[PDB]
Amino acid sequence: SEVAHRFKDLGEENFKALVLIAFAQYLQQCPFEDHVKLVNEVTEFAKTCVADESAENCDKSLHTLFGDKLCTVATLRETYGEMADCCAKQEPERNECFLQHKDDNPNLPRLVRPEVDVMCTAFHDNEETFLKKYLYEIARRHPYFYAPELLFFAKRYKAAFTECCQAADKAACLLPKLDELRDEGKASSAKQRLKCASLQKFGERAFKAWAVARLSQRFPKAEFAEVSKLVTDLTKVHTECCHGDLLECADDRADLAKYICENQDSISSKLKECCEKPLLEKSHCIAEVENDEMPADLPSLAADFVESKDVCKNYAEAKDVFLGMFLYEYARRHPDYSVVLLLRLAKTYETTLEKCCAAADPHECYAKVFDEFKPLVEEPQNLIKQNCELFEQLGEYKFQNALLVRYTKKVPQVSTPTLVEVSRNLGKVGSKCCKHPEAKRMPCAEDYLSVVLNQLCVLHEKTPVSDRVTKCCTESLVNRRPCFSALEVDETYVPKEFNAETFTFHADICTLSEKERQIKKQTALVELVKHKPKATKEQLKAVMDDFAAFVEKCCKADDKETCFAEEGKKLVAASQAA
Numbered sequence: 013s014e015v016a017h018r019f020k021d022l023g024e025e026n027f028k029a030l031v032l033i034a035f036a037q038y039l040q041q042c043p044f045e046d047h048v049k050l051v052n053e054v055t056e057f058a059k060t061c062v063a064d065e066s067a068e069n070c071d072k073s074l075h076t077l078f079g080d081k082l083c084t085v086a087t088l089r090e091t092y093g094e095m096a097d098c099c100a101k102q103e104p105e106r107n108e109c110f111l112q113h114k115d116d117n118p119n120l121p122r123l124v125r126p127e128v129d130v131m132c133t134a135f136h137d138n139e140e141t142f143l144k145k146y147l148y149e150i151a152r153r154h155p156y157f158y159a160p161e162l163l164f165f166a167k168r169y170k171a172a173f174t175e176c177c178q179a180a181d182k183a184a185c186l187l188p189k190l191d192e193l194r195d196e197g198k199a200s201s202a203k204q205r206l207k208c209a210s211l212q213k214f215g216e217r218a219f220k221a222w223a224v225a226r227l228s229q230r231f232p233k234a235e236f237a238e239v240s241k242l243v244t245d246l247t248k249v250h251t252e253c254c255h256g257d258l259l260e261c262a263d264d265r266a267d268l269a270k271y272i273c274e275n276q277d278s279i280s281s282k283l284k285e286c287c288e289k290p291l292l293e294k295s296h297c298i299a300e301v302e303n304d305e306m307p308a309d310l311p312s313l314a315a316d317f318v319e320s321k322d323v324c325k326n327y328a329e330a331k332d333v334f335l336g337m338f339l340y341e342y343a344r345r346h347p348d349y350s351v352v353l354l355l356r357l358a359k360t361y362e363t364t365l366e367k368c369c370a371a372a373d374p375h376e377c378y379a380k381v382f383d384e385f386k387p388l389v390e391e392p393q394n395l396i397k398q399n400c401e402l403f404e405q406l407g408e409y410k411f412q413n414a415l416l417v418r419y420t421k422k423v424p425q426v427s428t429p430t431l432v433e434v435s436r437n438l439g440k441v442g443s444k445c446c447k448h449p450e451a452k453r454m455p456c457a458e459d460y461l462s463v464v465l466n467q468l469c470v471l472h473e474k475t476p477v478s479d480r481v482t483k484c485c486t487e488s489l490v491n492r493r494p495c496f497s498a499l500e501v502d503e504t505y506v507p508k509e510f511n512a513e514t515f516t517f518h519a520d521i522c523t524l525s526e527k528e529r530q531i532k533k534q535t536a537l538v539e540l541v542k543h544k545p546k547a548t549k550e551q552l553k554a555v556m557d558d559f560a561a562f563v564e565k566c567c568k569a570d571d572k573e574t575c576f577a578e579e580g581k582k583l584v585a586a587s588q589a590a
C-alpha cells in the first residue's frame with residue numbers, strides 16, 4: 013500500500029492538509045464543503061490501509077485513488093464541463109488531462125476579508141475549519157503553490173491569529189501580519205511557477221543547471237560530488253510537486269532536509285541555526301540560508317577550462333559532467349552574479365566548445381572565450397543602472413506608468429488586464445532591487461524579472477494573440493529578458509477603434525481604494541496607447557492629466573452620477589484634438 017506508506021510518514025495532520033491542497037488545485041471551481049467531504053472519505057480509507065495493507069484497493073497508486081474520488085463530482089459538466097472528458101480517460105492520460113486543465117487565472121471572485129471581529133470569532137469557535145478554508149482559498153487560486161511550503165504559511169497564519177485575537181488592538185496587531193503574509197505568498201507562488209515552468213517546458217536538464225549554479229553559490233566549500241547529490245534529490249522533489257504528487261513531494265523534501273543537516277560540516281557552516289528547529293521551520297530555513305563565505309585560495313578557472321589542452325577531450329568524455337563542473341566552479345566564486353547570467357555564460361561556453369572542438373586547432377579557437385563573457389556581464393549591468401536611475405526619479409507609480417506605455421507599444425495585442433498586471437509587477441522590481449549596492453543589484457533584478465516575465469508568458473500561453481510574445485517565451489528560458497528588451501514597437505499593429513463603454517468612467521469608482529483608482533487610470537492609459545500607438549510620451553500626459561480632472565470633479569459634484577455620462581463624452585472630444 014502506498015497511501016499507507018505516506019500516511020505513516022506524514023501523519024494525520026499534514027496528510028489531510030496536502031490532500032486538500034491537491035484537490036483544491038485540481039478542481040479549483042468546486043466548493044469548500046465538497047472538497048472537505050472527499051478529503052475525509054479519502055482519509056478514512058487511508059486509515060484502514062494502515063491496518064490491513066490489502067483491504068479494498070489499498071494496493072493502488074495515488075493517481076487512481078485521487079482521480080476516481082474527484083471524478084465523483086467532475087462528471088457534472090454543467091459545473092465543470094471540460095472535466096468530464098478527463099474522467100472518461102484512464103490512469104496516465106487521466107492525470108495528464110487534469111494537469112493540463114489547471115487555470116493560472118481562475119475566474120474566481122476576489123477574496124475580501126471580513127472585519128477583525130469576525131475572523132477571530134470564526135477562528136476561536138472552530139480553529140480547524142478556519143485554517144482549512146485558508147489552504148483552500150490559496151490552493152485554488154495558485155494551482156502551483158509549493159505544497160510543503162503552504163503548510164508552513166498555514167502554521168504562521170495560525171500564529172498570527174493565535175496571538176493577535178488576544179491583543180488590545182486586534183486590528184492593529186493582525187492586519188499588518190496578514191499583509192506581510194499575503195505578499196510573501198504571491199512571491200513564493202511566483203518563484204514556484206517559474207520552477208515548474210522550467211521543468212515542464214524546457215526539460216530537467218535546465219532545472220539542474222539552475223540548481224547546480226544556485227546551490228554552488230550557497231555552498232562554496234562543498235565538493236562537486238556533494239552538490240551533484242543534492243541537485244539530484246532537489247530535482248526529484250520539484251518534479252513531483254509540479255506534477256501533483258504532493259504527498260511524496262512533501263516526504264522527499266523532508267528526507268532531504270534530514271540529510272543536509274546530518275552532513276552539515278560537509279556542506280555549509282551557516283546551517284547551524286536551521287537544523288536546531290522544527291521540520292517545517294527547518295526546511296524553510298535551509299531553503300533561505302545565506303551563502304557560506306568564499307574559500308580562501310582558489311585557482312583560476314582559466315587553468316582547467318581555457319588553458320589546459322585536454323579541454324575538448326574531457327568534454328567529449330562526459331559533456332554534462334564537465335559543464336556541470338564548469339558551472340559549479342564559476343558559480344562558487346561569483347555570488348555577485350545572477351543565476352540566469354551564470355547560465356547564460358555556461359551556455360556561451362558550451363556553444364564555443366561545440367564549435368571549437370571540431371576545429372583544426374581547438375586550443376587556438378577556444379582560447380579567448382572569456383572575451384565573449386565581457387559583453388554578457390556588462391549588458392545587464394548597464395540596463396539596471398539606467399532603469400534604477402529612472403526609478404529613483406519618477407517613483408513607483410510613474411515608473412509603472414512608463415513601463416505600461418513601453419510594453420503596450422511592444423505587444424499591443426496582449427489583453428489590457430494582463431498588461432496592467434505585468435507592468436505593475438515589473439515596476440515593483442525597482443522598489444525591491446534598486447535600493448541595493450551594485451554588488452547585489454543585478455542578481456536581484458535579473459532573477460526577479462525572470463519571475464515576472466514568466467507570469468506574462470503563462471498568462472499569454474492560455475490565449476495567444478502576439479507571435480512576438482510567443483517567440484520571446486519559447487525560444488530560450490535564460491534569454492527571455494534580453495529578447496523582450498530588444499523589442500521596440502510593433503510596426504504591424506493596426507490601431508484600435510474607440511469604444512464608448514471602454515472610456516466611460518462611472519461613479520462606482522468613487523468608492524474604491526486609492527489603489528483600484530490608479531489601476532483604473534492605468535487601464536485607461538493602456539487603452540489610450542492601443543488606440544494611438546504612434547502617439548508620444550508628451551501628449552499622453554496632457555490627456556492623462558485631464559482624466560484625473562474628470563473623476564475628482566464628477567466624483568465631488570452633487571449631481572447624481574450623471575456628470576459621469578455627460579462629461580464622459582466631453583473628455584473624448586478633447587483627446588481626439590491632440
Ligand SMILES: CC(C)Cc1ccc([C@H](C)C(=O)O)cc1
Pocket residue numbers: 395396399400403418438441442443445446457458461493496497
Ligand atoms: C529590474 C527593474 C528595476 C528594471 C527593469 C525592468 C524591466 C526591464 C525590461 C527589459 C524592459 O524595460 O522592457 C528592464 C529593467
Ligand SMILES: CC(C)Cc1ccc([C@H](C)C(=O)O)cc1
Pocket residue numbers: 214217218221335336339355358359362488489490491
Ligand atoms: C547546462 C548548461 C551548461 C547549458 C544550458 C542551460 C540552460 C538552457 C535553457 C533551456 C536556455 O537556453 O534558456 C540550455 C542550455
